Design a protein around this nucleic acid. Structure first.
Lengths: 109, 82, 97, 93, 98, 82, 109, 93
DNA sequence: TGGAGAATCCCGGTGCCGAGGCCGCTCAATTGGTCGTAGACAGCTCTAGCACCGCTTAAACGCACGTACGCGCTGTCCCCCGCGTTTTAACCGCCAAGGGGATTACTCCCTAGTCTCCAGGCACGTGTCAGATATATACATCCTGT
DNA sequence: ACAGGATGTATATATCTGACACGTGCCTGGAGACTAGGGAGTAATCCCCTTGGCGGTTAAAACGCGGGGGACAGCGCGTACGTGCGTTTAAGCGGTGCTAGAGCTGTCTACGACCAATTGAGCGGCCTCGGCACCGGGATTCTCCA
């Protein structure tokens, strides 16, 4: 006579898993005990960051007249922003490239 | 036994790298300096990679060893597992 | 015949190579160099296919960044050509020396 | 042999943001690495913060303080708002 | 006529003198007032222990000395003896703080 | 309320710091740059120090908070507890 | 009818404690279990490093015609060496000072 | 309230090296901080190394590999020799 | 200021291989209940952080003078760039053999947990000697005139 | 290239004082002696993926030559920064007083770990089609020399 089942993500109204995050926290040698509210917070933060990056990358991809996302678009989206460039300051992205810029002294005149 | 392979980094490749860096004119003494710097960097990474491989009692170097060795020195890499 | 002034093809190449995202070094010489270097630490080693690719990616990124800093140092002294002094100064300020 | 990743949730979020847009495998690998890196950073900071004050539990306050310490600028503010809203909604039900 | 030194001798003497010692080179009360004024924005009605200010002053002085050394190197690279703001900007930009 | 305290860093002190750094001649526009750099550095450290203090429900800033804040940015300090 | 007691440091022939190191390892959230040979290794390494630094500092202090050690001597000993300077590359020592050196261009001639 | 430090052992080592030489309090604080820092570094590296290989125990091999990874040059060689000798002597008795 | 010419951009048609969606099943997340301790709250004590006052003197401030250094201009020459030929090795398919990286079952030795007890290490006094502070002396260095 | 005067600095001697080295008492955390269970070491099997060799083709590397522009040295003019002196201003020190907040007990409850039974979400394998790479031809733009 049980009452079926409901995932904690549905209760919290999220898309990222909560039970998996709880298990990962409990088996990572971080602390002796883990509370009941930390996984929800962590999942929400991760989902927010992912959504931000994906939106910027999709804008770049549409600007280049394509319907798929490739590492070049991610590189452009990260490097053109300010806060994201601050966050990923010492990270290398494979098959990324560089931003185009030339010093003004070298230009012909 | 292999020897004298540092000369395989020809000057056209260095010129291409400089072009992507944004350089317009290059002196004639840059290539030896570039080769030395590259050798030092490669030695530093490979030593730690081999140490990681040897701790696990293996005879093959995997990509995860390289990723860990790069991460330990403050140069994180995205795209190869990890 | 037709000739270009010194400096036009350089700018064209700069734009061309700043537009793309490929590798700029031949693969077999790099693999041979990696194996030769690794010979000293241990004998009779074997490599997976992707470790060499990861090493090449990291090396190329490092070199490009170093060249950018060298160009800045060269410009600071009212010049257009880069010389070894610029590389040495850039490495020394950065803390690698 | 079973292997775990974050592909499904990333795809769901992408379909939420841009309804008609695909993604290749290399970008998926990059996204997976990014998620793992951020998770590790926040967890380690929270663990150290809990150790300083002579406690043996990790709660929402540690996560919030770690987020404030790590992220710069407006990202911290928006992340704090999102986390607080999520926890408040979860507790009610 | 009275006695005078050529421009540059006293500078070298001071360089040696201040490289020989291990003391603090900034007055204490102005630094404490500056610290309190800066801390005012983040939270109101704060109190400080006596040693926190000392730790802050130590760190600040070490940082400034290192920066000045790098600036002097950058200035010498361009065939000059006087240091100018361009050297500070270049040193900070190469180091990665900009 | 306190205001206009950045002017308490007089030019003789900056000259002494430069002397310990090994500088011989100084231009007349260095002092404003030095003051700005110092202000930025102090703000960056103090924000984290206050955050650490506030997490523990206290009203007094201790030396351990400063030590932790300095360590978090890659500048370890020896001599004040820790 | 017990057989008295013997500290593990005496068995290992060391000066640094072993039981305290074992306790610190077991309560630091490093791993689930700790072996029986790690504390001896760690204590030996720590003692060796301490002895090296102390010898160099004492040499400097005697060179300066003193019978006590002050932070200036530690700073001199660390910075004049190569391996130690490599190890403590990003550490500040309070009341330390700097090494004396002047660029050759600035000298009079 | 009890507080722990490494003063006694540092003093013993100093008396071993230089028989007649003192030390002030500030230098003692600096030495204490140095010892704590090195301990923390080695322990963290060993913990990560054990986690990579799917083990749940810390042994002498992890400590040795961490020492080889951390220290530069001859310091690693001499430290390895000292640790091996100490363990060998301890096991016999 | 005009033409020639070389490099870049735009548009339409073919084809193939990688990304998207479906199905079976098994292992990990959910539901329901028990128990013991980690942390919340109230109260009290004594340390240390803040504010005020007078005094002596060391450091900050303002001004005048003169010299050495930063900056612009000109000329000579060499070294690096652009282009056409000839030679070398990278790249792509295909085949073949074997070393070593992943699994599985069994067993045993090493580590966690508990109780007793007794020395090593910490907090608190006490005295003396290493170092800090005057004072006279002699040696070393700089700068102008000869 | 020297002579000599003026200034800054290292050396040797005599008096205080407070910080460091040592002794004593007590308590709590480390050592000794057992038991119980599961993590890791060892042997055997399977099959994937790494290394090695061969032949053909064309893209990339090496070589030589002719000019032109940029790196470098020398000279001259002007002004801004270093040195020294007289006047003004807060920093530093030694007391006194007051109270806010840090730090330590004692009681109690509600929250997280642990266990047993149940089922559905996510992973691996498989097909299928359309998004993008490639080729060919025409249009547009930028550079260089009269």
């Amino acid at each position: 006579t049980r009452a079926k089942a409901k995932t904690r993500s549905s209760r919290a109204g999220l898309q990222f898993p909560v039970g998996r995050v709880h298990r990962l926290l409990r088996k990572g040698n971080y602390a002796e005990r883990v509370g009941a509210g930390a996984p929800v917070y962590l999942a929400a933060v991760l989902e927010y960051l992912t959504a931000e990056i994906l939106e910027l990358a999709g804008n770049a991809a549409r600007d280049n007249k394509k319907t798929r996302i490739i590492p070049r678009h991610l590189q452009l989206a990260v490097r053109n922003d300010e806060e994201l460039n601050k966050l990923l300051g010492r990270v290398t992205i494979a098959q990324g490239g560089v931003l185009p810029n030339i010093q003004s002294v070298l230009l012909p005149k | 036994v292999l020897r004298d392979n540092i000369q395989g980094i020809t000057k056209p490749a260095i010129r291409r790298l400089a072009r992507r860096g944004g350089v317009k004119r290059i002196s004639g003494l840059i290539y030896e300096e570039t080769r030395g710097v590259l050798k030092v960097f490669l030695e530093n990474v490979i030593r730690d990679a081999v140490t990681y491989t040897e701790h696990a009692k293996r005879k093959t170097v995997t990509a995860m060893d390289v990723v860990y060795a790069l991460k330990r020195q403050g140069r994180t890499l995205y795209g190869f597992g990890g | 015949p037709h000739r270009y002034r010194p400096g036009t093809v350089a700018l064209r190449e700069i734009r061309r190579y700043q537009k793309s995202t490929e590798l700029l070094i031949r693969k077999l010489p790099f693999q041979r160099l990696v194996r030769e270097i690794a010979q000293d630490f241990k004998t009779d080693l074997r490599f997976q296919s992707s470790a060499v690719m990861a090493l090449q990616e990291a090396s190329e990124a490092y070199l490009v960044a170093l060249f950018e800093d060298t160009n800045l140092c060269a410009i600071h002294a009212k010049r257009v050509t880069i010389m070894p002094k610029d590389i040495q100064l850039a490495r020394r300020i950065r803390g690698e020396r | 042999t079973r292997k775990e990743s974050y592909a499904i949730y990333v795809y769901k979020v992408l379909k939420q943001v841009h309804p008609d847009t695909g993604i290749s495998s290399k970008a998926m690998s990059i996204m997976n690495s990014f998620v793992n890196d951020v998770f590790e950073r926040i967890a380690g900071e929270a663990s150290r913060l809990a150790h300083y004050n002579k406690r043996s539990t990790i709660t929402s306050r540690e996560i919030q303080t770690a987020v404030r310490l790590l992220l710069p600028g407006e990202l911290a503010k928006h992340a704090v708002s999102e986390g607080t809203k999520a926890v408040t909604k979860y507790t009610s039900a």
